[PDB]
Structures are given as C-alpha cells and as structure tokens.
C-alpha cells in the first residue's frame, strides 16, 4: 500500500518562507530517491528538485529557477521529505507533488526487501504566493439581447483567494452550463465567468439565478439574470 501525503501548503506573502512535508508509507523510504515536482495553474509540469538515498550520498539537485532559494532535505527516522522554500516569488504559486520518480523506479530494477515496488505520487499540496488580502467577489450579469439559442451568464469578479463555486437555479440547471477557469488579474484578484445557453422561448417562462459561493470570505450571492430591459 504505497502512499505519499503532502502537507504544509498555503498562502504566503512574497519574500516569506514555507516548509512542505511529505510523509511516506508502504515502501522502504530510506532506499528511495525523492523528488519535488511542481505545476503552476494551467501550465506544464516543472521538476523542482531531487535528493538521493543515504547509500548514494544523499546529495541534492535543484532546478535553475529555485536553485538558491529552495532546499530539499529528508528525515529517515519518520519517513519524511522536506522542501524548505525561502524568498518566495509570485511565480512559485503551484501544486507541489512529492514522488519516488523515474530514477527510483529505474534503479529498483522494475519492481522489488519486502515484496514489490511501484511508482508513487502524492495528492499534492497547493502553495499560493500573493500579497493580496481576502476579498469577496462582485457578481455582474451577462444579459442577452435574439434567435433560437440565447446565452446568459454571471461574471464573478475581484475575489481572493480561490476558489469560487457557481451553480444555476440552486443546482437544478446543468444542461448547457459552461463555467470557465478563473483568471488571475494583474491586480492580484481572480475573475471567473459562468455562462448558460437556453432556448429563447423560455426567457419569459423560466427564471435563471446563478448562485455564487466564496467561502474564504463567507460570501453567498444569488444573481438573477434576464435580458436587458430596453427601457
């Protein structure tokens, strides 16, 4: 039952420090090389670093953007791997995974003391670097005109931190709903959009309310959207 559990991720001001811990279970942690690999929002995977086994010297290799700021260590007595992050920058915001990695899987001669071995990854822990304060969003309507299909939506703007949940009609409307991934604006706040398509003949028969929930600031909003009144 191989398993890695990350912990320590959270919100940090730029320049601060943060210690990520990774607890191992189900395999011989002392004989494994351990790697930290991060993934920024919507971007590709990036290798942060790797520490070797005690037998292989236990030396560390670091990626270039984190070389003089991040430090990887290990505690064998409690099967833990540590990533110490100092002088945090905004571009360090990412989900961090710990893994045994391809070096461990390859130098183990496929599968295995004990019985076997398999490549293991953690669930990941999210590290957010931002000097922004907690702020609830403003919800604005995206009102339509029409032809046959009409689109109407909700703009959930200027909130921090993530996430925000958007449903429609208390969750009783799912068909044709497209909720887009949030965008980080240069102001430091997040913006999100949630649109719905619907036959125009039901614009006077049925009502449409988007329910927005931002739990970090304890904000609940129910915005009714309808075609803009020409008056």
């Amino acid at each position: 039952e191989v398993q890695l559990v990350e912990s320590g991720g959270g919100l940090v001001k730029p320049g601060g420090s943060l210690r990520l811990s990774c607890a191992a279970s189900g395999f011989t942690f002392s004989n494994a090389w351990m790697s930290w690999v991060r993934q920024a929002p919507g971007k590709g995977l990036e290798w942060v670093g790797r520490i070797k086994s005690k037998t292989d010297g236990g030396t560390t290799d670091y990626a270039a953007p984190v070389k003089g700021r991040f430090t990887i260590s290990r505690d064998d007595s409690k099967n833990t791997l540590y990533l110490q992050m100092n002088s945090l920058k905004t571009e360090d915001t990412a989900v961090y995974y710990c893994t045994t990695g391809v070096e461990t899987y390859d130098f183990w001669s496929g599968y295995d003391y004990d019985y076997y071995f398999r490549d293991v990854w953690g669930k990941g822990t999210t590290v957010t670097v931002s000097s922004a304060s907690t702020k609830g969003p403003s919800v604005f309507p995206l009102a339509p005109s029409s032809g046959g299909t009409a689109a109407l939506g909700c703009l959930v703007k200027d909130y921090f931190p993530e996430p925000v949940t958007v449903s429609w009609n208390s969750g009783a409307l799912t068909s044709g709903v497209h909720t887009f991934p949030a965008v980080l604006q240069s102001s430091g706040l997040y913006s999100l959009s949630s649109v719905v398509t619907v036959p125009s003949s039901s614009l006077g028969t049925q009502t449409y309310i988007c329910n927005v929930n931002h739990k970090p600031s304890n904000t609940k909003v129910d915005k009714r959207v309808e075609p803009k009144s020409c008056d």
Partner: protein, 215 residues
C-alpha cells in the same frame, strides 16, 4: 556537462478512438544512457509513469503503450486508444539534466463545429463601481484553435483582455472560450462601438459581434 533543453513536438494531436498515436520528444543534446521517461496526466490527478529508459514500460501499463528512440529523438506510441487514454503526455530526462517536456494534449476528434459568438456589455452596477468588462463568448466549437480580436471604434485592442477555455465537453467534445476586455469607466464612456471579431476554421469569414454603448 551542461544543461539540456527539451522540446516536445508537436503541441497538440487531434485523434479519435481506435487510432494510432505517435508523440515525439526532441532534445538539445544526447540524453545520457537513454534516460528518458514518459508520464501521462489527466486533469485533477497526479501524473502516471508510463515509460522509463526510452523503451521499458512499467508494471501494469497496458501493452498498447510503447516507447523508442535514443540520442536526441524519442517516441511514444499508442496502438489502439481507449476512452481513458485522452490526456496530456510529458517526457522527462534524467541523465545529466532533469527537465520535463512542454507537454502534448491528446483530445477527442469530431467534425468541425463553428463557435456561437455572443457579446455582453458591462452592467450598470459595474460601471457604478468604476470599471467596465465586456465579454465575448465563443460556444461549442471544434477544433481548439480560435482567434478573438477586440475592436473599440475600429481600434484594435491589445493587452487589456484575457481568455479562459473549458476542457472538452464530455457530451459533444466541443470547446468554449470566454474573452474579457477590461477598460476604465472613463475610457469606456469615450467610445461607442464595441466589437469582437472571431476567426475559426469552421467560418467562411471572420464573424464580428458588436454593440453600441448605451443602446
């Protein structure tokens, strides 16, 4: 020994179930001992190791996955794609350098579908707040490539708009894009016609959707 840069050609591979996928992975210099690996990542999940050492696959990986290559060029091959094989694929070196590849998405294939284009002016509440957000919605289109161009009194906007794209819709396998143009209230009230022009493969000519401020 120096650091090696890694390029993963191509960027995207449009593909249908049952077809044969061929992903390439190029390098800057020779990968030491052919230490190149292939991982698969589905959204919301951690990566899954598929191939290690150019051509050796891991325990449990189905036989349809294979790898090959050496020196400066490597290849991942899928013989018959299952409904679960649509994901992003990365290659990682671990000889002398340990960088990942840019990635390569494998999305479902379908008939070309033109986007439905809608435009939404800023609400009066937001204008009371002091900012104006105009929204251009491109709905239910395929393929992924699309171009949105903002025009304010025929002035091409650049640097004040942001785009968000959904994943492939599980039912119709299409995409949706949302573009937001952000202006100040002062700058918004100095212009009349606001338009977004969409360019997509399923359109004979770019389609412009517009409104006049206060109409």
């Amino acid at each position: 020994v120096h650091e090696i840069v890694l390029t993963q050609s191509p960027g995207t591979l449009s593909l249908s179930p049952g077809e044969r996928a061929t992903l390439s992975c190029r390098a800057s210099q020779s990968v030491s001992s052919s230490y190149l690996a292939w991982y698969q990542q589905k959204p919301g999940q951690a990566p899954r190791l598929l191939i290690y050492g150019a051509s050796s696959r891991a325990t449990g990986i189905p036989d349809r996955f294979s790898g090959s290559g050496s020196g400066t060029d490597f290849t991942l091959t899928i013989s018959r794609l299952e409904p679960e094989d649509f994901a992003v694929y990365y290659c990682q070196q671990y000889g002398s350098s340990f960088t990942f590849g840019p990635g390569t998405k494998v999305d479902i294939k379908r008939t070309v579908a033109a986007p439905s284009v809608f435009i939404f002016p800023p609400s009066d509440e937001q204008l009371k707040s002091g900012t104006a957000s105009v929204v251009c919605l491109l709905n239910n289109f395929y393929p992924r490539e699309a171009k949105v161009q903002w025009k304010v009194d025929n002035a091409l906007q650049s640097g004040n708009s942001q785009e968000s794209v959904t994943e492939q819709d599980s039912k119709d396998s299409t995409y949706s894009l949302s573009s937001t143009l952000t202006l100040s209230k002062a700058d918004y009230e100095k212009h009349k016609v606001y338009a977004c022009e969409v360019t997509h493969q399923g359109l004979s000519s770019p389609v412009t959707k517009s409104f006049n401020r206060g109409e």
